[PDB]
Amino acid sequence: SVDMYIERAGDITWEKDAEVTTTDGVYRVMTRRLLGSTQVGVGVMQEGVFHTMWHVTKGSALRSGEGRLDPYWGDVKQDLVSYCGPWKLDAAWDGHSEVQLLAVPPGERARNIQTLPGIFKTKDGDIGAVALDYPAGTSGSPILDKCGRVIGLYGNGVVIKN
Amino acid sequence: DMYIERAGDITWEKDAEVTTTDGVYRVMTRRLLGSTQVGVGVMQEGVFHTMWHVTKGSALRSGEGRLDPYWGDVKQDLVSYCGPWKLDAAWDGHSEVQLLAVPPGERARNIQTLPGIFKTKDGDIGAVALDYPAGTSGSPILDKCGRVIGLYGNGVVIKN
């Protein structure tokens, strides 16, 4: 048998004493393939909607506890996908404040790490990116502002407000 | 842009860890920012073999050419590019094998293991009991000869 499923890693909260530079939460995206199991990526369940990156799931349904979740919205060149309702994260980075990456690496427990993102040039126009390396399947891990909100997904850009 | 780049020769290796041109290639996707490894496959006799889930039949670009899917079955989770499926070798059901693992970010290696046997609905197959990071699947499984008996994630068909 084969099975792509999600399992909750924890609460999406900020933490002041952190390392400096359907129910809500972060979930691991896992695949069971035969005799193996692996973490293919991470996402955010918020207001009854699952948010992650396209390449993590390729739009596959995901099973959660004892129910299925079917993909509601997707864009592949943005590399994002939402399950069960439309995309719910509209917060953005101010372009100068430190942020906090809530990293769910595969095999290990979630942590918050606090860092100043760097900035890269796009076609339209420039965006903030988290300069840290984390193993493969950590991507889709949420990026928080101090307000506790999701400004972007790890291994993806953060949009800048000004 | 989903694309491929070669990781090495497909050979067995005796001193190994115990329990269009040919070769193994990484399947990579370009994201707006960096790049990521979505799986692995086998180029043999001008045909690229990987797992359907790795690409979902997407075309793949190689060098400056481009590869269009020739064969696919989703239930078996396999796809071939440029000609029909070319790997017909099977596992004997009792010998050690060698997984040629191309994990993401790391150089390829050969690992030698005796697969276990798993029950299917119809009926039973050999499966490699090792865990690798994501995008390592489609990595080729070799017999002692040097032949591809299966892909990592897919299991191996048993001969007799």
From Swiss-Prot, chain A:
Compartments, as annotated in UniProt: Host endoplasmic reticulum membrane
Membrane topology per record: Peripheral membrane protein
Signal peptide: none
Enzyme active site: H55 (charge relay system), D79 (charge relay system), S139 (charge relay system)
Maturation and modification: Ubiquitination by host TRIM22 leads to proteasomal degradation. Acetylated by host KAT5. Acetylation modulates NS3 RNA-binding and unwinding activities and plays an important positive role for viral replication.
Chain's role: Displays three enzymatic activities: serine protease, NTPase and RNA helicase. NS3 serine protease, in association with NS2B, performs its autocleavage and cleaves the polyprotein at dibasic sites in the cytoplasm: C-prM, NS2A-NS2B, NS2B-NS3, NS3-NS4A, NS4A-2K and NS4B-NS5. NS3 RNA helicase binds RNA and unwinds dsRNA in the 3' to 5' direction. Leads to translation arrest when expressed ex vivo. Disrupts host centrosome organization in a CEP63-dependent manner to degrade host TBK1 and inhibits innate immune response. Inhibits the integrated stress response (ISR) in the infected cell.
Subunit composition and interactions: Forms a heterodimer with NS2B. Interacts with NS4B. Interacts with unphosphorylated RNA-directed RNA polymerase NS5; this interaction stimulates RNA-directed RNA polymerase NS5 guanylyltransferase activity. Interacts with non-structural protein 2A. Interacts with host SHFL; this interaction promotes NS3 degradation via a lysosome-dependent pathway. Interacts with host CEP63; this interaction disorganizes the centrosome and inhibits host innate immune response.
Name used for this protein in its record: Serine protease NS3
Protein source organism: Zika virus (isolate ZIKV/Human/Cambodia/FSS13025/2010) (ZIKV)
Phylogenetic placement of the source organism: Viruses, Riboviria, Orthornavirae, Kitrinoviricota, Flasuviricetes
Residue span relative to the full protein: 1420 to 1660 of 3423
UniProtKB/Swiss-Prot annotation, chain B:
Modification after translation (UniProt): Ubiquitination by host TRIM22 leads to proteasomal degradation. Acetylated by host KAT5. Acetylation modulates NS3 RNA-binding and unwinding activities and plays an important positive role for viral replication.
Domain Peptidase S7, first and last residues per copy: 20-160
Active site positions, chain numbering: H53, D77, S137
First and last residue of the signal peptide: none
Highest taxon, organism lineage: Viruses
Coiled coil: none
Topology class, membrane: Peripheral membrane protein
Intracellular or extracellular location(s): Host endoplasmic reticulum membrane
Biological role stated in the UniProt entry: Displays three enzymatic activities: serine protease, NTPase and RNA helicase. NS3 serine protease, in association with NS2B, performs its autocleavage and cleaves the polyprotein at dibasic sites in the cytoplasm: C-prM, NS2A-NS2B, NS2B-NS3, NS3-NS4A, NS4A-2K and NS4B-NS5. NS3 RNA helicase binds RNA and unwinds dsRNA in the 3' to 5' direction. Leads to translation arrest when expressed ex vivo. Disrupts host centrosome organization in a CEP63-dependent manner to degrade host TBK1 and inhibits innate immune response. Inhibits the integrated stress response (ISR) in the infected cell.
Assembly with partners or alone: Forms a heterodimer with NS2B. Interacts with NS4B. Interacts with unphosphorylated RNA-directed RNA polymerase NS5; this interaction stimulates RNA-directed RNA polymerase NS5 guanylyltransferase activity. Interacts with non-structural protein 2A. Interacts with host SHFL; this interaction promotes NS3 degradation via a lysosome-dependent pathway. Interacts with host CEP63; this interaction disorganizes the centrosome and inhibits host innate immune response.
Name the UniProt record assigns to this protein: Serine protease NS3
Shown segment, full-protein numbering: 1422 to 1660 of 3423
